[PDB]
Amino acid sequence: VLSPADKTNVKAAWGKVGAHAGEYGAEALERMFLSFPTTKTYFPHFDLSHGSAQVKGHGKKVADALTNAVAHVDDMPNALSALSDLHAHKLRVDPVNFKLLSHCLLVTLAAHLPAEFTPAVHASLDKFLASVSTVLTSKYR
Amino acid sequence: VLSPADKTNVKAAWGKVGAHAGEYGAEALERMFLSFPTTKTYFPHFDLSHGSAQVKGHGKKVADALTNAVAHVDDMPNALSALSDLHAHKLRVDPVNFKLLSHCLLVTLAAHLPAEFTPAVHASLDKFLASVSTVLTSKYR
Amino acid sequence: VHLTPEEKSAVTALWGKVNVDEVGGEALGRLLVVYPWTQRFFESFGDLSTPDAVMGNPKVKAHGKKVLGAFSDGLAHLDNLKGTFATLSELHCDKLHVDPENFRLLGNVLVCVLAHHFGKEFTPPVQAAYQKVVAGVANALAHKYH
Amino acid sequence: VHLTPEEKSAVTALWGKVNVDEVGGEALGRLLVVYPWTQRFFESFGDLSTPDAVMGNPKVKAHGKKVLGAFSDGLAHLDNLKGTFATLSELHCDKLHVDPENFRLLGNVLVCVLAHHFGKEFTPPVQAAYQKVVAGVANALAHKYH
Ligand code: HEM
Numbered sequence: 011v012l013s014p015a016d017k018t019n020v021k022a023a024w025g026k027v028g029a030h031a032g033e034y035g036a037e038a039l040e041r042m043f044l045s046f047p048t049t050k051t052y053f054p055h056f057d058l059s060h061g062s063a064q065v066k067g068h069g070k071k072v073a074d075a076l077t078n079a080v081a082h083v084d085d086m087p088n089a090l091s092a093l094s095d096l097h098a099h100k101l102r103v104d105p106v107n108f109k110l111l112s113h114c115l116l117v118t119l120a121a122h123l124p125a126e127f128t129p130a131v132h133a134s135l136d137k138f139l140a141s142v143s144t145v146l147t148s149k150y151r
Numbered sequence: 152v153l154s155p156a157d158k159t160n161v162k163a164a165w166g167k168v169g170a171h172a173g174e175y176g177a178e179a180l181e182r183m184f185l186s187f188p189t190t191k192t193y194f195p196h197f198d199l200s201h202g203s204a205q206v207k208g209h210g211k212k213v214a215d216a217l218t219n220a221v222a223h224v225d226d227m228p229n230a231l232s233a234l235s236d237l238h239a240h241k242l243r244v245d246p247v248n249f250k251l252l253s254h255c256l257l258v259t260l261a262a263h264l265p266a267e268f269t270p271a272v273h274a275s276l277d278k279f280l281a282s283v284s285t286v287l288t289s290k291y292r
Numbered sequence: 293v294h295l296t297p298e299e300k301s302a303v304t305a306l307w308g309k310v311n312v313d314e315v316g317g318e319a320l321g322r323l324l325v326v327y328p329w330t331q332r333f334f335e336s337f338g339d340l341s342t343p344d345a346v347m348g349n350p351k352v353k354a355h356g357k358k359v360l361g362a363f364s365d366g367l368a369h370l371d372n373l374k375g376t377f378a379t380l381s382e383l384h385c386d387k388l389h390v391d392p393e394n395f396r397l398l399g400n401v402l403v404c405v406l407a408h409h410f411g412k413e414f415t416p417p418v419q420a421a422y423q424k425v426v427a428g429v430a431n432a433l434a435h436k437y438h
Numbered sequence: 439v440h441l442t443p444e445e446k447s448a449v450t451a452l453w454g455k456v457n458v459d460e461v462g463g464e465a466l467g468r469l470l471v472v473y474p475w476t477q478r479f480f481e482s483f484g485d486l487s488t489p490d491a492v493m494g495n496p497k498v499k500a501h502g503k504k505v506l507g508a509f510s511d512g513l514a515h516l517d518n519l520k521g522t523f524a525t526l527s528e529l530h531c532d533k534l535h536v537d538p539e540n541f542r543l544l545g546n547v548l549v550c551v552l553a554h555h556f557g558k559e560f561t562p563p564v565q566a567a568y569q570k571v572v573a574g575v576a577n578a579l580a581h582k583y584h
């Protein structure tokens with residue numbers, strides 16, 4: 011549900027990401043497409059090769075949505091309500107895939123923030139990404 | 152999240168259960184212990200044999216908690232807040248086990264209400280049991 | 293996929309009373325109704341806007357038939373579910389790309405349908421026997437993922 | 439547990455730089471911190487009230503050592519992870535009763551630790567190579583459940 015310590019941990023860790031958000035978003039996506047091929051089926055109209063500008067520009071979208079979530083954490087449901095319909099109503103994304111992305115987001119963050127990735131912040135981010143996942147799959151639940 | 156149709160479907164289906172709630176609760180537990188042995192590890196102090204009065208009396212507890220949930224559906228989080236701490240803080244129950252129980256609750260309901268178990272009510276109950284699961288594992292999330 | 297002869301007798305006896313024509317579609321349909329995202333793999337079956345439409349859709353009961361086909365086929369080969377499914381495995385894995393988590397779901401809904409139809413005769417012991425089988429069938433299909 | 443020679447070279451080269459003593463406890467500890475319910479299986483390790491306490495707990499880094507032991511052991515036997523783990527499988531399955539879903543979790547956190555320590559050198563391609571391995575180790579242990 012996110013304790014006052016988690017909220018504080020998530021805001022600080024995201025802060026250290028700053029202008030790299032967009033880049034990091036594209037990295038998690040790439041990590042997910044290669045590690046979990048079964049997710050590529052949702053992006054036929056994308057070129058999933060390494061330097062893809064489509065995957066590049068999409069990462070910014072994903073990153074900006076998380077940024078929306080971090081800056082409105084006390085009200086994700088309403089803030090991301092829009093993205094919920096799009097992921098549950100139109101695209102019909104398998105709920106499991108949100109866990110796979112969340113995982114890739116964590117490997118990425120950890121691979122760029124060696125100082126900030128303490129076990130406390132690690133658990134914090136995980137809870138947070140879980141909350142974002144629950145909201146995006148609520149039109150299912 | 153439970154649409155007005157789901158709430159209506161859950162209240163009606165639970166209604167048809169009436170005074171059998173307690174019995175049905177004990178049946179789901181038994182179905183779970185035999186189908187998923189890995190859950191028995193939480194009840195060392197119980198006699199898991201068939202006619203166990205302990206499993207009998209526990210089913211009433213489980214059933215009455217769901218009854219609490221159905222009659223306060225618009226506010227489960229607060230209503231079951233108590234049970235959340237007990238399942239996440241003290242007992243530390245693996246989140247996966249809630250899915251296994253939910254499944255057994257559905258096989259049981261379906262095996263006693265052939266007329267009311269239409270696919271619509273089936274999806275309804277599943278969403279509902281999922282909501283009860285989310286709340287009981289929120290001290291984790 | 294062990295199965296004690298006691299369990300073997302339950303699965304067999306019960307499975308021999310199953311209306312193959314209806315049961316397969318009862319499950320497939322319910323899968324698509326209760327776990328919407330699965331509808332993504334059957335966009336060609338036509339209209340699936342409501343449970344009513346889904347349960348009456350001829351393409352559904354027609355496919356359920358085949359799906360049920362596989363179980364009985366795997367049921368008379370518990371000794372080697374792995375090979376019995378190699379073909380379908382290649383099919384759902386490196387072709388359709390269905391996440392193996394959904395194989396557990398069909399197996400569980402299949403089980404709910406069996407409980408819906410047999411009622412009391414579908415005792416806890418009988419259910420646990422089927423959970424093993426359904427678990428063995430789900431692992432067999434996901435093999436090509438390893 | 440296929441692994442192309444290209445993947446084989448990534449897992450090997452990288453794994454040979456790993457501080458076995460620290461990494462094993464970095465993962466075990468983080469598992470217990472991020473997925474609390476897992477603490478249930480280590481009540482005897484002492485105090486685990488806070489991450490600080492958990493990460494410093496000697497029983498933890500001591501066990502992590504062994505856990506990491508198994509991976510390297512399974513890493514030099516990708517050809518047959520199934521048998522390499524029969525013993526541990528019997529152990530975690532029909533003895534400790536750990537739900538196989540938690541084997542995926544340790545494998546994923548293990549991976550996060552590897553990314554934390556190697557940073558940039560831990561490229562997406564290298565990660566995908568490890569996901570296969572971690573996936574193969576998790577399946578091997580859960581075998582005694584089938
Ligand atoms: C917490 C993680 C996720 C967040 C924050 C997220 C966010 C977004 C956002 C903001 C959009 C685009 C909105 C727009 O441009 O109008 C989007 C689109 C999309 N997402 Fe996600 N998403 C997440 C997870 C997933 C997962 C798990 C999948 C599937 C593996 C997925 C599949 C898609 C697809 C296919 C689109 C449409 C892309 C296109 O056609 O251009 N998303 N997502």
Ligand code: HEM
Nearest residue numbers: 190193194212213216217234238242244248249252283284
């Ligand atoms: C939605 C399903 C569930 C509900 C509604 C529920 C409800 C309850 C209730 C009301 C109590 C007893 C409260 C009291 O008497 O003070 C309880 C206790 C307990 N539950 Fe659950 N529970 C659920 C799922 C689970 C699962 C998944 C497990 C593990 C497989 C579990 C393990 C326990 C244990 C060990 C106790 C304590 C029993 C004792 O020591 O007497 N529960 N649960």
Ligand code: HEM
Nearest residue numbers: 330333334358359362363380388390394395398399429433
């Ligand atoms: C319990 C495991 C399952 C079994 C036993 C099973 C069995 C089968 C069989 C026998 C076929 C037809 C093969 C043929 O016509 O030659 C098939 C096709 C197919 N299955 Fe499944 N299946 C399973 C789970 C799933 C799930 C969960 C999905 C995904 C939602 C799925 C999606 C498909 C699709 C789309 C086809 C149709 C391909 C076509 O249009 O020709 N299956 N399956």
Ligand code: HEM
Nearest residue numbers: 476479480504505508509526534536540541544545575579
């Ligand atoms: C990725 C899979 C895992 C591997 C490779 C692994 C490996 C091992 C090894 C090598 C041992 C020690 C065996 C010995 O001392 O002879 C062990 C023991 C044990 N494992 Fe794991 N393990 C895994 C996952 C887990 C998980 C997720 C849990 C549950 C939270 C768990 C709980 C235990 C416990 C409690 C023991 C200690 C038994 C004792 O006190 O003697 N393991 N494991």
